Amino acid sequence: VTVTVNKNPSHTVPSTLYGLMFEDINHSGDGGLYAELLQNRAFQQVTPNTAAALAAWHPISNAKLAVIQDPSPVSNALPNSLQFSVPSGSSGRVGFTNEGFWGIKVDSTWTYKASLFFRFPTSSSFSGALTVGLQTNAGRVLAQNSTQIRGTTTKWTQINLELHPTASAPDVSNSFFVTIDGAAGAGQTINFAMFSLFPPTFKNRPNGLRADIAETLAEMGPSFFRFPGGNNLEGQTTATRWQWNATVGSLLDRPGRVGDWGYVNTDGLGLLEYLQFFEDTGMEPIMAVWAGYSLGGTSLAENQLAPYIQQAIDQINFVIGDPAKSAPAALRASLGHPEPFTLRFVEVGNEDFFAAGSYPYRWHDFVTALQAQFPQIRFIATTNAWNPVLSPVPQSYDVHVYQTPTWFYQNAFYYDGFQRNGTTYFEGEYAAISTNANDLFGTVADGRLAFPTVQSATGEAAFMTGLERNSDIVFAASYAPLLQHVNSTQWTPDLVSYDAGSVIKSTSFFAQKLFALNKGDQYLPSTLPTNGGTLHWSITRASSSGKTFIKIANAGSSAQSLTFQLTQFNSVSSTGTLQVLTGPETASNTPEAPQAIVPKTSTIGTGKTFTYNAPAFSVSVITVTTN
Ligand SMILES: *[C@@H]1O[C@H](CO)[C@@H](O[C@@H]2O[C@H](CO)[C@@H](O[C@@H]3O[C@H](CO)[C@@H](O)[C@H](O)[C@@H]3O)[C@H](O)[C@H]2NC(C)=O)[C@H](O)[C@H]1NC(C)=O
Numbered sequence: 001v002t003v004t005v006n007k008n009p010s011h012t013v014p015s016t017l018y019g020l021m022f023e024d025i026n027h028s029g030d031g032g033l034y035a036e037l038l039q040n041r042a043f044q045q046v047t048p049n050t051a052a053a054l055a056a057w058h059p060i061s062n063a064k065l066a067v068i069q070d071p072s073p074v075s076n077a078l079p080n081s082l083q084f085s086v087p088s089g090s091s092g093r094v095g096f097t098n099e100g101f102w103g104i105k106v107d108s109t110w111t112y113k114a115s116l117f118f119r120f121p122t123s124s125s126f127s128g129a130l131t132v133g134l135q136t137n138a139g140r141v142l143a144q145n146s147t148q149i150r151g152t153t154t155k156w157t158q159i160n161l162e163l164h165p166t167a168s169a170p171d172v173s174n175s176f177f178v179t180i181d182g183a184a185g186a187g188q189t190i191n192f193a194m195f196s197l198f199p200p201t202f203k204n205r206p207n208g209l210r211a212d213i214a215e216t217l218a219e220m221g222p223s224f225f226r227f228p229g230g231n232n233l234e235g236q237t238t239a240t241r242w243q244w245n246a247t248v249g250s251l252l253d254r255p256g257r258v259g260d261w262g263y264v265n266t267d268g269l270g271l272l273e274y275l276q277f278f279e280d281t282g283m284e285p286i287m288a289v290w291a292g293y294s295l296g297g298t299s300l301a302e303n304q305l306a307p308y309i310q311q312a313i314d315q316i317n318f319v320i321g322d323p324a325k326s327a328p329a330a331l332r333a334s335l336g337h338p339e340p341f342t343l344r345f346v347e348v349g350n351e352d353f354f355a356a357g358s359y360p361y362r363w364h365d366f367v368t369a370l371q372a373q374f375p376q377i378r379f380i381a382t383t384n385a386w387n388p389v390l391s392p393v394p395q396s397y398d399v400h401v402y403q404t405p406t407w408f409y410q411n412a413f414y415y416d417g418f419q420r421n422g423t424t425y426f427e428g429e430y431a432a433i434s435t436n437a438n439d440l441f442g443t444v445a446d447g448r449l450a451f452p453t454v455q456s457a458t459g460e461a462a463f464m465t466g467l468e469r470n471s472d473i474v475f476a477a478s479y480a481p482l483l484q485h486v487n488s489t490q491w492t493p494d495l496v497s498y499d500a501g502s503v504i505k506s507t508s509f510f511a512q513k514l515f516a517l518n519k520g521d522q523y524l525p526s527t528l529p530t531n532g533g534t535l536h537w538s539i540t541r542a543s544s545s546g547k548t549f550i551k552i553a554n555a556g557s558s559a560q561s562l563t564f565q566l567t568q569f570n571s572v573s574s575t576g577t578l579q580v581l582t583g584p585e586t587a588s589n590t591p592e593a594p595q596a597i598v599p600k601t602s603t604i605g606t607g608k609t610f611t612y613n614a615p616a617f618s619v620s621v622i623t624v625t626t627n
């Protein structure tokens, strides 16, 4: 096919076109992007004196463990403590371990920071060393440090110790440990609370993020971060929704919450840590506010909304407000950030097409109040576009789609037929998740993708050429879900996977990165792709440099030739770069073969005319300079 490139741009490409969608799903927060290495660190939201309260914790030797509703808890937010008792007549090493999130990476090039709170609930003559450390799951000690404690310490006391492994472990089957001498400790009871183990963090942020994962997200060159969900915003009930104020301040003051994917969230990855990550990466937030629906099906009545609308105003004030004018903005100042953060976009709820009977009134009351307080923010509606009809008229809608790879190349003209009437669209969740049109959300045996494939990434890329062509009205687009702990999965496929030790960049991650990193501010119209066809392209140009990015998706099983005609330009560089992602149709990056499919960069000859053969199942970017 001959593709004529117009030199005259049709529209400016929004700075926000490509970004990320985050919720704590598949242990993407706890266990994932948040760097904390101990699971169930503070006994949040568990039933005392049950086995589940002790999840991830194990005795060493004859130690007696229980999770208790502490008569004198470490804080209002953390009512539970680990009661540790050493039997009469004990000896040697007695204590307990934490298995981490399916392991702990023990690296001798890393210093770890261990902390806990303890008290003796009954004053005693105990005198001896408390030891913390890391050990292989055989009990082989790799790091250890200790400090002297006394049984006369009946008030809550924090211990802070650094750990330096003598050797890197051969795998991630390691545990954190706390021990005392069994003979010196015989008959003693200690109460513990609020444990923590951190490795070095992204940008050395206190209370920060896991370095490999955060660097992988930054590598993708995102412009926005949609958070905190997603289903994980909503809760199962009003009382279990996400709440911004429970996520800020000391970790002692964060009660956690049962999230929407089977596990407790610490809320250690809270509002200020999200905003700090945006600052560190140059992303802006697309921040959701709870909108009076939870996933057990309860809508708040119209006459119940007021306090929840005020909470949403308080949440935005934390982010942008003048510290002299509100308590939440003074709190941001008090936590070391007096300058407001950037916030231009707020999403009202999540997937309110599930509660379309109530969303008209919830949308109306939330947006009337929030637009009055925040006249510069753009509020995004979550129902299906224009059904039901909302008031006020939404300036933006969030569109989600999970479909087959084939649907994605067949629907690359999704936005071409939309009216241009001042509405902008966020593709806030999309993914090609299955090859089975009959059962998209079924099992891997029934066609669900365990991991993104070449087929699914190339279908996506064809659809993304439409997003870019239609970027006059499409302002933002994110794959979902972003992250996956391969040891605790609730949804596949995911953009980036990991275990406790290493990261797996999917084929779809590479498609996302090739689109995002190779994007100009000018959209250059070109010969249209065949609507329904397997072959798609989108061309942008950087006004400041003339760097021109020709993105090509062949989502089909046939190689296809393209001849580009740049005759309308004055000059075209005599060479260009080619970046290509390709492979067999069903190929994936997996924990066992994490680099099976990776992009290849080369130099090609270019000019006012050149020919490229787009291989079957490929994503290609050709960069040239045009003036
Ligand atoms: C985070 O902030 C929210 C408010 O934006 C706090 O929720 C509010 O908590 C108070 C005190 O528990 C609630 O009032 C209580 O209501 C009950 C039930 O009718 C009544 O029996 C009590 O005397 C009291 O008035 C209030 O309704 C609730 N507001 C909302 C919107 O949920 C929340 O506690 C804060 N979280 C943390 C950890 O501080």
Ligand SMILES: *[C@@H]1O[C@H](CO)[C@@H](O[C@@H]2O[C@H](CO)[C@@H](O)[C@H](O)[C@H]2NC(C)=O)[C@H](O)[C@H]1NC(C)=O
Residues within 6 Å of the ligand: 144, 145, 146, 160, 161, 162, 163, 164
């Ligand atoms: C045990 O942990 C203590 C506390 O983290 C370590 O001592 C700290 O070492 C750092 C780094 O040199 C200093 O900045 C701190 O001032 C030290 N604090 C104290 C109270 O000494 C100690 O090095 C660790 N020991 C081992 C064997 O890992």
Ligand SMILES: *[C@@H]1O[C@H](CO)[C@@H](O[C@@H]2O[C@H](CO)[C@@H](O)[C@H](O)[C@H]2NC(C)=O)[C@H](O)[C@H]1NC(C)=O
Residues within 6 Å of the ligand: 385, 386, 389, 393, 419, 420, 421, 422, 423
């Ligand atoms: C932008 O254009 C769309 C498409 O015509 C309008 O959408 C229609 O909205 C009405 C209600 O306002 C619905 O009953 C129609 O079914 C919608 N049409 C389609 C094809 O979805 C939308 O109203 C327009 N928005 C503005 C701000 O003018």
Ligand SMILES: *[C@@H]1O[C@H](CO)[C@@H](O[C@@H]2O[C@H](CO)[C@@H](O)[C@H](O)[C@H]2NC(C)=O)[C@H](O)[C@H]1NC(C)=O
Residues within 6 Å of the ligand: 102, 103, 486, 487, 499, 591, 592
């Ligand atoms: C976490 O998941 C990894 C990745 O699936 C598991 O490691 C694999 O274990 C399987 C099944 O035993 C082996 O066939 C693979 O060869 C392992 N792959 C790799 C890349 O190591 C691991 O066992 C899981 N961890 C836990 C605690 O369940």
Ligand SMILES: [Cl-]
Residues within 6 Å of the ligand: 404, 405, 406, 407, 434, 435, 436
């Ligand atoms: Cl398909």
